[PDB]
Amino acid sequence: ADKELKFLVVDDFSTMRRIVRNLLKELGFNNVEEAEDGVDALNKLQAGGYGFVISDWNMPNMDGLELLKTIRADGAMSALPVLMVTVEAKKENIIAAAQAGASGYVVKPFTAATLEEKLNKIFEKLGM
Ligand code: BEF
Ligand code: BEF
Ligand code: BEF
Ligand code: BEF
Ligand SMILES: [Mg+2]
């Protein structure tokens, strides 16, 4: 995929945002911005130009599921890829996220190999 693709990494733990940013850097993606919850993410998305969102689930103010539903419902960004990356591992969470339009799902903790794979699967599926 295009190495200039612009990512938004959303997670309320700065520890986790840094981890994702660094793995993406390792894979060749340097165009990365950050948000600390769903409200903040929606503010940043309106700056335009974003091509991919990686989102946590548990966050204050607006959680990852609500963020996902908001993205899918808005004509400006309804086809934006959204990869969930979260501690929530239960079947019910995986099902709810998929039903709400998630592009993929990763359970923390995860390796760079898992991320590259999860990312690639989405790139192929969407023709990116
Ligand atoms: F995660 Be933020 F920096 F509070
Ligand atoms: F990165 Be966030 F905006 F604190
Ligand atoms: F807080 Be996240 F859902 F891992
Ligand atoms: F459960 Be399906 F999406 F109607
Ligand atoms: Mg969290």
Side-chain angles (χ1 to χ4, degrees), residues 11-15 17 34-36:
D11 197 302
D12 61 326
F13 281 56
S14 63
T15 308
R17 293 200 307 269
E34 302 176 27
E36 72 185 41

PDB file of all heavy atoms in Angstrom, residues 11-15 17 34-36, ligand 1:
ATOM      1  N   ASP A  11      -6.189   6.072  20.937  1.00  0.00           N
ATOM      2  CA  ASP A  11      -6.094   5.264  22.161  1.00  0.00           C
ATOM      3  C   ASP A  11      -5.919   6.215  23.342  1.00  0.00           C
ATOM      4  O   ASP A  11      -5.193   7.198  23.234  1.00  0.00           O
ATOM      5  CB  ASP A  11      -4.912   4.278  22.077  1.00  0.00           C
ATOM      6  CG  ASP A  11      -4.999   3.161  23.107  1.00  0.00           C
ATOM      7  OD1 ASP A  11      -5.046   3.470  24.314  1.00  0.00           O
ATOM      8  OD2 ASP A  11      -5.038   1.973  22.703  1.00  0.00           O
ATOM      9  N   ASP A  12      -6.618   5.967  24.444  1.00  0.00           N
ATOM     10  CA  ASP A  12      -6.523   6.887  25.582  1.00  0.00           C
ATOM     11  C   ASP A  12      -5.217   6.715  26.374  1.00  0.00           C
ATOM     12  O   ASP A  12      -4.835   7.596  27.127  1.00  0.00           O
ATOM     13  CB  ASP A  12      -7.768   6.829  26.491  1.00  0.00           C
ATOM     14  CG  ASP A  12      -8.010   5.453  27.108  1.00  0.00           C
ATOM     15  OD1 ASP A  12      -7.708   4.425  26.456  1.00  0.00           O
ATOM     16  OD2 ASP A  12      -8.529   5.403  28.249  1.00  0.00           O
ATOM     17  N   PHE A  13      -4.528   5.596  26.172  1.00  0.00           N
ATOM     18  CA  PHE A  13      -3.224   5.373  26.796  1.00  0.00           C
ATOM     19  C   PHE A  13      -2.107   5.796  25.839  1.00  0.00           C
ATOM     20  O   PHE A  13      -1.940   5.206  24.776  1.00  0.00           O
ATOM     21  CB  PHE A  13      -3.045   3.890  27.195  1.00  0.00           C
ATOM     22  CG  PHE A  13      -3.738   3.513  28.472  1.00  0.00           C
ATOM     23  CD1 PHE A  13      -5.094   3.713  28.639  1.00  0.00           C
ATOM     24  CD2 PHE A  13      -3.011   2.969  29.528  1.00  0.00           C
ATOM     25  CE1 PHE A  13      -5.728   3.366  29.818  1.00  0.00           C
ATOM     26  CE2 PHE A  13      -3.633   2.618  30.718  1.00  0.00           C
ATOM     27  CZ  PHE A  13      -4.985   2.825  30.878  1.00  0.00           C
ATOM     28  N   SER A  14      -1.338   6.820  26.214  1.00  0.00           N
ATOM     29  CA  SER A  14      -0.240   7.263  25.359  1.00  0.00           C
ATOM     30  C   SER A  14       0.807   6.162  25.161  1.00  0.00           C
ATOM     31  O   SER A  14       1.507   6.145  24.152  1.00  0.00           O
ATOM     32  CB  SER A  14       0.408   8.541  25.909  1.00  0.00           C
ATOM     33  OG  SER A  14       0.988   8.311  27.193  1.00  0.00           O
ATOM     34  N   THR A  15       0.930   5.270  26.149  1.00  0.00           N
ATOM     35  CA  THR A  15       1.798   4.104  26.050  1.00  0.00           C
ATOM     36  C   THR A  15       1.472   3.287  24.805  1.00  0.00           C
ATOM     37  O   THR A  15       2.370   2.847  24.076  1.00  0.00           O
ATOM     38  CB  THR A  15       1.619   3.174  27.278  1.00  0.00           C
ATOM     39  OG1 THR A  15       1.755   3.927  28.494  1.00  0.00           O
ATOM     40  CG2 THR A  15       2.642   2.052  27.251  1.00  0.00           C
ATOM     41  N   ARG A  17      -0.466   4.307  22.095  1.00  0.00           N
ATOM     42  CA  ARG A  17      -0.323   5.076  20.864  1.00  0.00           C
ATOM     43  C   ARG A  17       1.120   5.013  20.383  1.00  0.00           C
ATOM     44  O   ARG A  17       1.383   4.846  19.191  1.00  0.00           O
ATOM     45  CB  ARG A  17      -0.759   6.525  21.069  1.00  0.00           C
ATOM     46  CG  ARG A  17      -2.249   6.688  21.347  1.00  0.00           C
ATOM     47  CD  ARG A  17      -2.692   8.119  21.057  1.00  0.00           C
ATOM     48  NE  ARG A  17      -1.855   9.098  21.767  1.00  0.00           N
ATOM     49  CZ  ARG A  17      -2.116   9.577  22.976  1.00  0.00           C
ATOM     50  NH1 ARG A  17      -3.199   9.191  23.636  1.00  0.00           N
ATOM     51  NH2 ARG A  17      -1.288  10.461  23.534  1.00  0.00           N
ATOM     52  N   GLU A  34      -2.207  11.247  16.036  1.00  0.00           N
ATOM     53  CA  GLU A  34      -2.782  10.612  17.229  1.00  0.00           C
ATOM     54  C   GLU A  34      -4.011  11.337  17.789  1.00  0.00           C
ATOM     55  O   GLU A  34      -4.136  12.563  17.665  1.00  0.00           O
ATOM     56  CB  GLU A  34      -1.716  10.502  18.332  1.00  0.00           C
ATOM     57  CG  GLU A  34      -0.480   9.709  17.922  1.00  0.00           C
ATOM     58  CD  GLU A  34       0.604   9.692  18.996  1.00  0.00           C
ATOM     59  OE1 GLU A  34       0.273   9.816  20.197  1.00  0.00           O
ATOM     60  OE2 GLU A  34       1.787   9.555  18.625  1.00  0.00           O
ATOM     61  N   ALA A  35      -4.903  10.581  18.424  1.00  0.00           N
ATOM     62  CA  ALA A  35      -6.039  11.142  19.168  1.00  0.00           C
ATOM     63  C   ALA A  35      -6.248  10.362  20.467  1.00  0.00           C
ATOM     64  O   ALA A  35      -5.916   9.178  20.538  1.00  0.00           O
ATOM     65  CB  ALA A  35      -7.308  11.085  18.321  1.00  0.00           C
ATOM     66  N   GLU A  36      -6.823  11.005  21.481  1.00  0.00           N
ATOM     67  CA  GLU A  36      -6.888  10.396  22.819  1.00  0.00           C
ATOM     68  C   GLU A  36      -8.267   9.826  23.176  1.00  0.00           C
ATOM     69  O   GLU A  36      -8.412   9.128  24.178  1.00  0.00           O
ATOM     70  CB  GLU A  36      -6.417  11.384  23.891  1.00  0.00           C
ATOM     71  CG  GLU A  36      -7.404  12.503  24.148  1.00  0.00           C
ATOM     72  CD  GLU A  36      -6.873  13.529  25.124  1.00  0.00           C
ATOM     73  OE1 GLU A  36      -5.680  13.880  25.024  1.00  0.00           O
ATOM     74  OE2 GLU A  36      -7.651  13.981  25.987  1.00  0.00           O
TER      75      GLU A  36
HETATM   76  F1  BEF B   1      -3.308   9.924  26.474  1.00  0.00           F
HETATM   77 BE1  BEF B   1      -3.325  11.291  26.570  1.00  0.00          BE
HETATM   78  F2  BEF B   1      -2.065  11.798  26.379  1.00  0.00           F
HETATM   79  F3  BEF B   1      -3.795  11.654  27.803  1.00  0.00           F
END
